[PDB]
Structures are given as structure tokens and as C-alpha cells.
Write a protein that binds this ligand. Sequence first.
Ligand code: HEM
Length: 457
Amino acid sequence: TIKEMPQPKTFGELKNLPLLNTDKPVQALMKIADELGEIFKFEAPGRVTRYLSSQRLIKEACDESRFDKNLSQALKFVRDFAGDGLFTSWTHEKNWKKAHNILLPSFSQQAMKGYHAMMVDIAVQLVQKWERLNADEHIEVPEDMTRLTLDTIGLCGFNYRFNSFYRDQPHPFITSMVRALDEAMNKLQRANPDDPAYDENKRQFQEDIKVMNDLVDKIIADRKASGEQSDDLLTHMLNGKDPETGEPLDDENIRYQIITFLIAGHETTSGLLSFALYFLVKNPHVLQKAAEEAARVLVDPVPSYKQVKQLKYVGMVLNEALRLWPTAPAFSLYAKEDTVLGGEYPLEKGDELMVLIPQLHRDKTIWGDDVEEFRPERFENPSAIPQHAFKPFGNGQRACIGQQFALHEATLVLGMMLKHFDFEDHTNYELDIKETLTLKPEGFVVKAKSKKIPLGG
Ligand code: HEM
């Protein structure tokens, strides 16, 4: 029966936006959810959002007949350079359906067999980099895991080598990409956009978009003109036809899809690898069980596809790091028609709901009371986990098309790290989680000692 909905402190006319004027907004909304409960209204000048935290309400918010993906304010800002790629378009835009239908078979677990050798290439570069460190040096974990995921998506994506392990300062496309992304998350905070001084940032944003567009546009043009067939996603987009309409993707959208795979895949997947290594280094018993499995399964100088799939406990370790810190922490929904949530909170057509995934993954009624503990074994039998309890890759037909690509990568890389190195938390690191569109451990450094096992070819 109809209930109330809390609201945090307001600052009249600015309403609750100062509560989000922090460098850590998701972790600040997790402190607010702890004191107000499973749903709360958050209001800013112009918008109203309700944040959901319990599986009880989120299983309802995940019914596709009543709710659909919303383009939140962050995604509308990202659409300026990601366009109508899969991530920043509405389900009912014609290009979302057409790209979804063409790309879906290329992102299956069976299609990972074709991208495997390209993922091993960048994985071996990372391992070889750490093999070659001298005994006085340490690893900057988030920074080499972002080198590893940029280069893997560049090479599986459009067969281009960004050669991030050969540089100190990134290839200028990556610099533009990070800076555009950065600019788009800063426009959220700036309650006074367009003009004062911002027009310098705004001028700069136009140039970063031009660098992205120009490099990708050229790759596509050179590709159609030479016509060689590789096993990257760009050839599957260039030769693919939507079975519903019979149409191909146009060249401008193919570009947006390539920019979208970079921006949607690089930080989420490297954040994941960083958090999994943290929790392993902080939990020696888990590390030993994971390192044992890697040494038993990965018996060849380079892992085969079938060997990565047998790395059952490494997969449980990554699932539990995604429970505790889902690297893309919230997604947004809008009500399709007037409806009631739970049987007690009235919603109107078009109201926005935001799923706060890190809180969902801390619901004591589903996970038990050791919710804050790192226990991979929670996932030993994955069918025993209630529907809509575990949502790190979103929901339904708008879930992460790249789910299988991210988990194969992460399992491959984590299995080879544990196989080849013993790790030491030489500084006794204290977790500080930096927020962008994504979450990562800021400053996590480790020392790796080699077990001197050959990494051949
Ligand atoms: C640890 C890894 C990752 C996590 C946690 C993650 C999570 C997510 C989430 C939560 C969404 C839904 C967002 C929303 O509903 O607004 C999503 C969508 C998407 N992700 Fe991922 N992602 C990851 C890896 C990747 C990778 C590697 C790629 C691509 C190479 C990728 C590409 C996509 C795309 C294109 C969409 C949009 C699908 C659609 O709407 O049709 N993601 N991802």
C-alpha cells in the first residue's frame, strides 16, 4: 500500500545537487542509500531520479515490458562523440536494432575463439613487460591494465596497434578519447554550462572529437579500398547485413561502434582486473587456491581457448570482484507507462530510475550477512543465485554485448598473471576508488616476482 520515498537534505533551488558535488559521487550515493533505504528520490534543477538498491525493487525495474533503458545525462553527453553507437542510442532508434542484430553473433562466447590469438598477443606483451622489471621496480596496476585493454580492443576491433607498451605517453587518439570522456563527465558538475570560461574546454572538446573521427574514418576507408579480410570486428561490420531490414551499417555508424567499443570496454575491463588483483593480494588464501588452478590448467607456454574456459575458480574470483565493486556502477531506466513499484511507489510514464549496482550486490536478504567479505565460493553454483540479484552487465536486450569478451580477456590475463608471478603488496595499499564513468583503484602498486616459467612462441 502506497508509501512515502525519502529525499536527502536539500539546498533550496539547487535541491540535492551539492550532495553530488564530491569527487566520489557513487560512493556518496551508497552512503545516502545506507541511511535512506532501498529507493529514494534525488532531485537536481530540472531532473528527478529515484535510486533503487534492493533486489526486491530492481527485479521489478528489470521487467522489459514496463521499463526500458534511459539515456541518462552522462550518456547524452557521451553521444556527442559516441553518436548512435550501441551504448548511447534508445532501443527504438533504428540503428540500435540494426547494429544489435548484426553484432550479436560476433560477441558470442563461440566467436571468442577467433579473437583469442589476438587477446594472447597483448597478454604476452604485459607478462613480458613484468618479467623484465629489475628488482627495485614495482607495477602500477590500473595503468598497465588500461594499456592492456586499449590495445586488445584496438587490435580485436579494427586491427590497429596502439603499442601502449612501447610508450610512456599514449598514442594521441587515446589521449583525445580520455580527454573527451573527461570533459563529458565534468559537464555534469558544472551547473552553469555553455559560457563563462568553459568555451576553452569546449573548443578543446571539438578537436578531440576530430582526432577520434579522423583516425577511425581513415581505417574504414583504407579497409574498403584494400578489401582484406581479417578476424576483427570491423570486417564483421563491413560485410554484415541486418537480417530484419536487409540493410548494412553505414560508414558513419561503424565509426561510432568502434569508438563505442573503446570507451565502453577499456575502463570497465581494466578496472575489473585491478580490483580482482587487489582482493587476491589482500586475501592470501584465495590467491593460493587461484594460483594453484592456473598452474594446473595453463600447462602450455601460451593458453589455448579451451584452457581459459577450465579456469573455473579464476572465473569465480572475477565474479566476486564484480559483486563487490561493479566497475560500471549504475544504469538508468524510464517507466514505459504509469505503474507502481513494489505495490507501493507510484511511478508515471517517463520517470527515471537509477539502479545502484554496488548496493544491489550488498543486499543482506540475498547474499547473507558476510556481504562485505571477499568469498569467491558464493559463486560455486551460479544457478543458486536468484534472478536479478547479480547485474554487473546491465539488463535484458540492453545488457553488455561485450560480457563474454570482457570475461574471456580477464580470465586469460588473470590466469597468466598467477601462473607466472608471485605478488607482494609491498606498500600495504589502502583502497581509494577513483570515479570517472567507471570505478578503479587509484594508486594500486604491487611488486611481482617471477617464477621463471617460459612464455613461448
Ligand atoms: C568488466 C566489464 C564490463 C562491465 C562491468 C560492463 C558493463 C556494462 C553495463 C552495465 C552496460 C549497460 C549500460 C546501460 O544499461 O546503460 C553495458 C553495455 C554495453 N557494453 Fe559493457 N561492460 C564491460 C565490458 C564491455 C566490453 C569489453 C565491451 C565492448 C568491447 C562492452 C561494450 C558494451 C556495449 C556496446 C554496450 C551497449 C549494449 C546495448 O545497449 O546494445 N562492455 N556494459
